Amino acid sequence: RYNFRGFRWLQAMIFAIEEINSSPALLPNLTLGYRIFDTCNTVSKALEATLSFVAQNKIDSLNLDEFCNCSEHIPSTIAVVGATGSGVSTAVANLLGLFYIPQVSYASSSRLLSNKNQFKSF
Amino acid sequence: RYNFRGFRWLQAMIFAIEEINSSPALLPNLTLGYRIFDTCNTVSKALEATLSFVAQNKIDSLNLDEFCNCSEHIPSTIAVVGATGSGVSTAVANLLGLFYIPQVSYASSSRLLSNKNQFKSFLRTIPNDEHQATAMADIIEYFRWNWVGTIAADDDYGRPGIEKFREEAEERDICIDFSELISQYSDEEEIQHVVEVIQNSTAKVIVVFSSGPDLEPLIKEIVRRNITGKIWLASEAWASSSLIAMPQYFHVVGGTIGFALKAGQIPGFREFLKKVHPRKSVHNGFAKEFWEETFNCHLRPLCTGDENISSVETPYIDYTHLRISYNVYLAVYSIAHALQDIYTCLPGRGLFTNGSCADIKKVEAWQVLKHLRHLNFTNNMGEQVTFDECGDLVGNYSIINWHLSPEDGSIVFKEVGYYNVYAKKGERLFINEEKILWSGFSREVPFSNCSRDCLAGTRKGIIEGEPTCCFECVECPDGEYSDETDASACNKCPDDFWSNENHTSCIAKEIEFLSW
Amino acid sequence: AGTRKGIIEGEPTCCFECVECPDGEYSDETDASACNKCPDDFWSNENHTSCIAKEIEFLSW
Ligand SMILES: *[C@@H]1O[C@H](CO)[C@@H](O[C@@H]2O[C@H](CO)[C@@H](O)[C@H](O)[C@H]2NC(C)=O)[C@H](O)[C@H]1NC(C)=O
Ligand SMILES: *[C@@H]1O[C@H](CO)[C@@H](O[C@@H]2O[C@H](CO)[C@@H](O)[C@H](O)[C@H]2NC(C)=O)[C@H](O)[C@H]1NC(C)=O
Ligand SMILES: O=C(O)[C@@H]1Cc2c([nH]c3ccccc23)CN1
Ligand SMILES: O=C(O)[C@@H]1Cc2c([nH]c3ccccc23)CN1
Ligand SMILES: *[C@@H]1O[C@H](CO)[C@@H](O)[C@H](O)[C@H]1NC(C)=O
Ligand SMILES: *[C@@H]1O[C@H](CO)[C@@H](O)[C@H](O)[C@H]1NC(C)=O
Ligand SMILES: *[C@@H]1O[C@H](CO)[C@@H](O)[C@H](O)[C@H]1NC(C)=O
Ligand SMILES: *[C@@H]1O[C@H](CO)[C@@H](O)[C@H](O)[C@H]1NC(C)=O
Ligand SMILES: *[C@@H]1O[C@H](CO)[C@@H](O)[C@H](O)[C@H]1NC(C)=O
Ligand SMILES: [Ca+2]
Ligand SMILES: [Ca+2]
Ligand SMILES: [Ca+2]
Ligand SMILES: [Ca+2]
Ligand SMILES: [Ca+2]
Ligand SMILES: [Ca+2]
């Protein structure tokens, strides 16, 4: 199915980023980019997107006794905006707080995400 | 903290793999390898291990337009055995089912992992926890209690079980006074509040869906304040925990009634356990710390290397039954039997398109998942093992009691009954009350009703703001009679009859006239 | 008023019946869980809503 409200939210994020870039007072001489994916209200899609986000930290993983390298020009995401559902946000929060990447949600409101022992960067 | 039971489970997995390798009948000319990590009962470590597992499936990931590179030395994990916690299992299962890697757990029992619209590749050798909550309700109903309390862990294991117990209890006219949530990281204020809630109640029986590491702070605080005279109904997670079944806690947690899984037989397992050595174990890197903690040495005095394992009493060998270890054994054998069923595929009977078969030399994870979904094999003891449409394996329960040891002074786990999950509803619970020692020493069943039952000649009356179980009885009025105990209202006598002085029955009226 | 609440078995406390108070007791207000045995020298109405002083009987001039 197609969600027009979700596309409006995506447009809101893009609009905010562009307005930050145009303004000369907030972060002079610095530009903000973005990499925005669709979750389809499903954990699997959001987890694929999160793996894309943390590929660099996968390169920086410690468990692997043998090194692995990816494309150098792959950007390292500083912070993530999302997501809507609480289960999606829980899974994404696990993966992101594995690497201490801030994640600011806009519609997840479950109390289980108020635990800073499990969700450090949420 | 070091867990010797977990190291025993790891050794059980290694033993099963080696036994399968030695066996010529199972997987001829094929050798099984392994890669085993430590979760530390934490989601983060398990997720790092899972990332290491899927490092090779992540090569052909669509989310990245660019191409990632991984060394060929990194192997491809075909299946995973783990894990213990239900939250840990959920976190691992997300990533594993992202790539259709089968995952067979041995201790996770949350019902939330039965949903296959989220957890595509998940299997269990331990039964689901609906039956355990129903069995706790059956026990409470059997011993004729109606006024109980509930404690649960704030995770994926405690909450669904406590909810199932709540609904099953309200179906059976059982009233729950309090319900609290505890965690391993609960502040002093939270523990104090829960302890105060326990004190303020008058309900002796308390039902706990939790684990040892999560129940430890509450038990410690209760022992610190000496809150005795409580009846504890344990779930399988902490009914046999070494962190709660410690003798100096006995006066608080004596006479506890709990659940246990049906044990199993692994011939030759103890001999494999006793052969551990830090130097001989090159594949097993967890032997060094195990040895250091066993003999309190550092290889603090050094380790001579000539110590005997049996000299130190640890859960590594100081055990009686093998229940979770049998689950690990069954998990490994189930994966091996799926691989064998792949290896013996007839050309026109495959599970795949047009009856095609897989190639065991280039077998893939999803094919093994398909074969696990249709698995049917016979155990060493001689039982059939299949998984349902949700990947569950149903089994019996043994109801145990916490007694004291006359010789050692430790805590014994006597068997006082069984719960047969295969029987019809209402004929599943069996208990020998002649062996239960309430509070560890007593021989009379404790009383755990809100209010006392009221005898003939009275009727119940509502106490405002309190549940149905709590009531105050008022004597029957003149003319009405009450011939039952715990009656909602006084029955009225027929014509030409009037109530006794007791109102238990009613006599016939007298007739007065001037007589001869 | 005049009737007290009664327990229905197998139902929560929110669900109740109600029955008239016995002769000698009354129920002035609603949501009453009991009927008051009101003091000496007093009996109940025919509707058990309040109390009436008992009639004193003796030979009168
Ligand atoms: C669960 O427990 C019940 C009762 O303990 C088992 O039923 C018994 O099975 C044995 C044979 O294994 C019979 O000799 C008994 O007569 C049975 N008792 C009954 C029916 O009350 C049942 O087999 C167990 N389930 C298992 C082992 O999967
Ligand atoms: C506590 O309350 C329970 C109510 O659930 C009482 O159980 C009843 O016991 C009588 C005994 O004759 C049975 O006839 C009823 O059927 C039971 N009610 C049930 C099972 O719902 C129990 O007896 C009470 N405790 C005491 C000590 O009387
Ligand atoms: O946490 C959650 O699941 C909900 C999801 C949600 C909320 N508000 C919404 C509006 C539109 C679509 C979805 C939502 C509140 N937080
Ligand atoms: O789902 C869970 O978390 C529990 C954990 C658990 C169970 N049984 C155990 C025995 C020992 C240690 C841990 C456990 C039951 N499933
Ligand atoms: C316990 O009861 C006392 C006495 O009424 C009260 O002061 C206290 O707040 C109660 N505590 C809890 C946790 O209910
Ligand atoms: C705790 O209570 C038990 C039983 O009442 C008693 O035997 C024991 O001495 C108590 N210990 C303390 C420290 O109060
Ligand atoms: C599993 O195999 C046994 C034969 O040992 C058979 O009796 C049983 O019906 C089979 N179960 C299923 C579900 O195929
Ligand atoms: C009424 O109760 C008294 C007190 O126990 C008893 O002695 C008497 O027999 C009872 N009357 C009956 C049961 O008719
Ligand atoms: C008693 O109450 C009834 C209401 O059911 C009323 O109709 C009647 O007049 C009352 N009788 C009195 C107050 O004497
Ligand atoms: Ca700017
Ligand atoms: Ca979403
Ligand atoms: Ca674990
Ligand atoms: Ca334990
Ligand atoms: Ca109340
Ligand atoms: Ca009911």
CSV table of N, CA and C in Angstrom, one decimal, chain A residues 35 37 43-45 47-53 55 58 61-71 73-74 91 94-95 98-99 111-112 117-118, chain B residues 35 37 43-45 47-52 55 58 61-64 66-71 73-74 91 94-95 98-99 118 120 154 159 181 185:
chain,number,residue,atom,x,y,z
A,35,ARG,N,20.6,10.3,3.8
A,35,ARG,CA,20.3,9.0,3.2
A,35,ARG,C,19.1,8.4,3.8
A,37,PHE,N,15.6,5.9,3.7
A,37,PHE,CA,15.1,4.7,3.2
A,37,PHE,C,13.7,4.5,3.7
A,43,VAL,N,10.1,-4.8,10.2
A,43,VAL,CA,11.4,-4.8,10.9
A,43,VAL,C,12.5,-5.1,9.9
A,44,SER,N,12.3,-6.0,8.9
A,44,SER,CA,13.3,-6.5,8.0
A,44,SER,C,13.9,-5.4,7.2
A,45,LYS,N,13.0,-4.6,6.6
A,45,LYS,CA,13.4,-3.5,5.7
A,45,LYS,C,14.3,-2.5,6.5
A,47,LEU,N,15.9,-3.0,9.2
A,47,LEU,CA,17.2,-3.6,9.6
A,47,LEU,C,18.2,-3.6,8.4
A,48,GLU,N,17.7,-3.9,7.2
A,48,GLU,CA,18.6,-3.7,6.0
A,48,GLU,C,19.1,-2.3,5.9
A,49,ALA,N,18.2,-1.3,6.1
A,49,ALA,CA,18.7,0.1,6.1
A,49,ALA,C,19.7,0.4,7.2
A,50,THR,N,19.5,-0.2,8.4
A,50,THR,CA,20.4,0.0,9.5
A,50,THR,C,21.7,-0.6,9.2
A,51,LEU,N,21.8,-1.8,8.6
A,51,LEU,CA,23.0,-2.4,8.2
A,51,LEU,C,23.7,-1.5,7.2
A,52,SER,N,23.0,-0.9,6.2
A,52,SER,CA,23.6,0.1,5.4
A,52,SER,C,24.2,1.3,6.2
A,53,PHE,N,23.5,1.7,7.2
A,53,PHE,CA,24.0,2.8,8.0
A,53,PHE,C,25.3,2.5,8.7
A,55,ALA,N,27.5,-0.1,8.1
A,55,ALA,CA,28.6,-0.8,7.4
A,55,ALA,C,30.0,-0.4,7.8
A,58,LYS,N,30.7,-1.9,11.0
A,58,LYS,CA,31.0,-3.3,10.7
A,58,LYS,C,32.4,-3.5,10.3
A,61,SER,N,34.2,-3.6,13.4
A,61,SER,CA,33.8,-4.7,14.3
A,61,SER,C,35.0,-5.3,14.9
A,62,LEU,N,34.8,-5.8,16.2
A,62,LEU,CA,35.9,-6.5,16.9
A,62,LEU,C,35.8,-8.0,17.0
A,63,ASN,N,34.6,-8.6,16.8
A,63,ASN,CA,34.5,-10.0,16.9
A,63,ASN,C,35.3,-10.7,15.8
A,64,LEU,N,35.2,-10.2,14.6
A,64,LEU,CA,35.8,-10.9,13.4
A,64,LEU,C,37.3,-10.9,13.6
A,65,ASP,N,37.9,-12.2,13.7
A,65,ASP,CA,39.3,-12.3,13.7
A,65,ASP,C,40.0,-12.0,12.4
A,66,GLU,N,39.3,-11.9,11.3
A,66,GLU,CA,39.8,-11.5,10.0
A,66,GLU,C,39.1,-10.2,9.6
A,67,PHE,N,39.9,-9.3,9.1
A,67,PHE,CA,39.4,-8.0,8.7
A,67,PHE,C,38.6,-8.1,7.4
A,68,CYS,N,37.7,-7.1,7.3
A,68,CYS,CA,36.9,-6.9,6.1
A,68,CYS,C,36.7,-5.4,5.8
A,69,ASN,N,36.9,-5.1,4.5
A,69,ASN,CA,36.9,-3.7,4.1
A,69,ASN,C,35.8,-3.5,3.0
A,70,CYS,N,35.2,-2.3,3.0
A,70,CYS,CA,34.2,-1.9,2.1
A,70,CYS,C,34.6,-0.7,1.3
A,71,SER,N,33.7,-0.1,0.5
A,71,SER,CA,34.0,1.1,-0.2
A,71,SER,C,34.3,2.3,0.7
A,73,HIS,N,34.2,5.5,0.0
A,73,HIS,CA,33.3,6.7,-0.1
A,73,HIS,C,32.0,6.4,0.5
A,74,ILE,N,31.7,5.3,1.2
A,74,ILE,CA,30.5,5.0,1.8
A,74,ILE,C,30.4,6.0,3.0
A,91,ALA,N,14.4,-2.7,17.3
A,91,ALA,CA,15.4,-3.4,16.6
A,91,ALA,C,16.5,-2.5,16.1
A,94,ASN,N,18.7,-1.4,19.0
A,94,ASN,CA,19.7,-2.4,19.3
A,94,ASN,C,20.9,-2.2,18.4
A,95,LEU,N,20.7,-2.2,17.1
A,95,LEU,CA,21.8,-2.2,16.2
A,95,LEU,C,22.6,-0.9,16.3
A,98,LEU,N,24.5,-0.5,19.5
A,98,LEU,CA,25.7,-1.3,19.5
A,98,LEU,C,26.9,-0.4,19.2
A,99,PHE,N,26.7,0.6,18.4
A,99,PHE,CA,27.9,1.5,18.0
A,99,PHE,C,27.8,2.9,18.5
A,111,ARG,N,6.8,2.8,26.3
A,111,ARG,CA,7.6,3.0,27.5
A,111,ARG,C,8.8,2.1,27.5
A,112,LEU,N,8.8,0.9,26.8
A,112,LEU,CA,9.9,0.0,26.8
A,112,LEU,C,11.2,0.7,26.2
A,117,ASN,N,19.5,1.2,29.9
A,117,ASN,CA,20.3,0.0,30.0
A,117,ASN,C,20.4,-0.7,28.7
A,118,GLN,N,19.2,-0.8,28.0
A,118,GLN,CA,19.1,-1.5,26.7
A,118,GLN,C,19.2,-0.6,25.5
B,35,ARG,N,31.6,-22.4,15.4
B,35,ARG,CA,32.1,-21.1,15.9
B,35,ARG,C,31.2,-20.7,17.1
B,37,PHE,N,30.5,-18.2,20.6
B,37,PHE,CA,30.8,-17.0,21.3
B,37,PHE,C,30.0,-16.9,22.5
B,43,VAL,N,22.3,-8.3,25.1
B,43,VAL,CA,21.9,-8.3,23.7
B,43,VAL,C,23.1,-7.8,22.8
B,44,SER,N,23.9,-6.9,23.4
B,44,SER,CA,25.0,-6.3,22.6
B,44,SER,C,26.0,-7.4,22.1
B,45,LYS,N,26.5,-8.2,23.1
B,45,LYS,CA,27.5,-9.2,22.7
B,45,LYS,C,26.9,-10.2,21.7
B,47,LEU,N,24.6,-9.6,19.6
B,47,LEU,CA,24.4,-9.0,18.3
B,47,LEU,C,25.8,-8.9,17.6
B,48,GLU,N,26.9,-8.6,18.3
B,48,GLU,CA,28.2,-8.7,17.7
B,48,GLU,C,28.5,-10.1,17.1
B,49,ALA,N,28.2,-11.1,17.9
B,49,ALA,CA,28.3,-12.5,17.4
B,49,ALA,C,27.5,-12.7,16.2
B,50,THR,N,26.3,-12.2,16.2
B,50,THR,CA,25.4,-12.4,15.0
B,50,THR,C,25.9,-11.7,13.8
B,51,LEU,N,26.5,-10.5,14.0
B,51,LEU,CA,27.1,-9.8,12.9
B,51,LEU,C,28.3,-10.6,12.3
B,52,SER,N,29.1,-11.2,13.2
B,52,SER,CA,30.1,-12.1,12.7
B,52,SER,C,29.6,-13.3,12.0
B,55,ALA,N,28.3,-12.0,8.4
B,55,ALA,CA,29.3,-11.2,7.7
B,55,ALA,C,29.4,-11.6,6.2
B,58,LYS,N,26.0,-10.8,4.3
B,58,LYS,CA,25.9,-9.4,4.0
B,58,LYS,C,26.6,-9.0,2.7
B,61,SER,N,23.9,-7.8,-0.2
B,61,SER,CA,22.9,-7.1,0.5
B,61,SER,C,22.5,-5.9,-0.4
B,62,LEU,N,21.2,-5.8,-0.6
B,62,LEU,CA,20.7,-4.8,-1.6
B,62,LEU,C,20.8,-3.4,-1.0
B,63,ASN,N,20.8,-3.2,0.3
B,63,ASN,CA,20.7,-1.9,0.9
B,63,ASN,C,21.9,-1.0,0.5
B,64,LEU,N,23.0,-1.6,0.2
B,64,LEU,CA,24.2,-0.8,-0.3
B,64,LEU,C,24.3,-1.0,-1.8
B,66,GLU,N,27.0,0.1,-3.4
B,66,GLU,CA,28.4,-0.2,-3.5
B,66,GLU,C,28.6,-1.7,-3.2
B,67,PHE,N,29.8,-2.1,-3.5
B,67,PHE,CA,30.2,-3.5,-3.3
B,67,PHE,C,31.1,-3.6,-2.0
B,68,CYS,N,30.7,-4.5,-1.1
B,68,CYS,CA,31.5,-4.8,0.1
B,68,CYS,C,32.4,-6.0,-0.2
B,69,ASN,N,33.5,-6.0,0.5
B,69,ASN,CA,34.5,-7.0,0.4
B,69,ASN,C,34.8,-7.7,1.7
B,70,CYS,N,34.8,-9.0,1.7
B,70,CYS,CA,35.1,-9.8,2.9
B,70,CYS,C,36.0,-11.0,2.5
B,71,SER,N,37.0,-11.2,3.3
B,71,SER,CA,38.0,-12.3,3.0
B,71,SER,C,37.3,-13.6,3.0
B,73,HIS,N,38.4,-16.3,4.0
B,73,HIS,CA,38.7,-17.1,5.3
B,73,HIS,C,37.4,-17.1,6.2
B,74,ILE,N,36.6,-16.0,6.1
B,74,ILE,CA,35.4,-16.0,6.8
B,74,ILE,C,34.4,-17.1,6.3
B,91,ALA,N,16.4,-10.5,19.5
B,91,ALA,CA,17.4,-9.7,18.8
B,91,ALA,C,18.2,-10.4,17.8
B,94,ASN,N,16.0,-11.5,14.7
B,94,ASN,CA,15.8,-10.5,13.6
B,94,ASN,C,16.8,-10.6,12.5
B,95,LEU,N,18.1,-10.5,12.9
B,95,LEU,CA,19.2,-10.5,11.9
B,95,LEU,C,19.2,-11.9,11.2
B,98,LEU,N,16.6,-12.3,8.8
B,98,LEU,CA,16.8,-11.4,7.6
B,98,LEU,C,17.5,-12.2,6.5
B,99,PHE,N,18.3,-13.1,6.8
B,99,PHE,CA,19.0,-13.9,5.8
B,99,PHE,C,18.6,-15.4,5.7
B,118,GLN,N,7.0,-12.7,11.8
B,118,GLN,CA,8.2,-11.9,12.2
B,118,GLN,C,9.5,-12.7,12.3
B,120,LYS,N,10.9,-15.8,10.9
B,120,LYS,CA,10.8,-16.8,9.9
B,120,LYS,C,11.5,-18.0,10.2
B,154,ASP,N,10.9,-7.7,33.9
B,154,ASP,CA,10.5,-6.7,32.9
B,154,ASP,C,11.2,-7.0,31.6
B,159,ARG,N,6.8,-11.0,31.2
B,159,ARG,CA,5.5,-10.3,30.9
B,159,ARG,C,4.5,-11.2,30.2
B,181,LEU,N,7.0,-5.4,38.9
B,181,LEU,CA,8.0,-5.7,37.9
B,181,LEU,C,9.4,-5.5,38.5
B,185,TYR,N,18.7,-4.6,37.1
B,185,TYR,CA,19.3,-3.3,37.3
B,185,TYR,C,18.3,-2.4,38.0
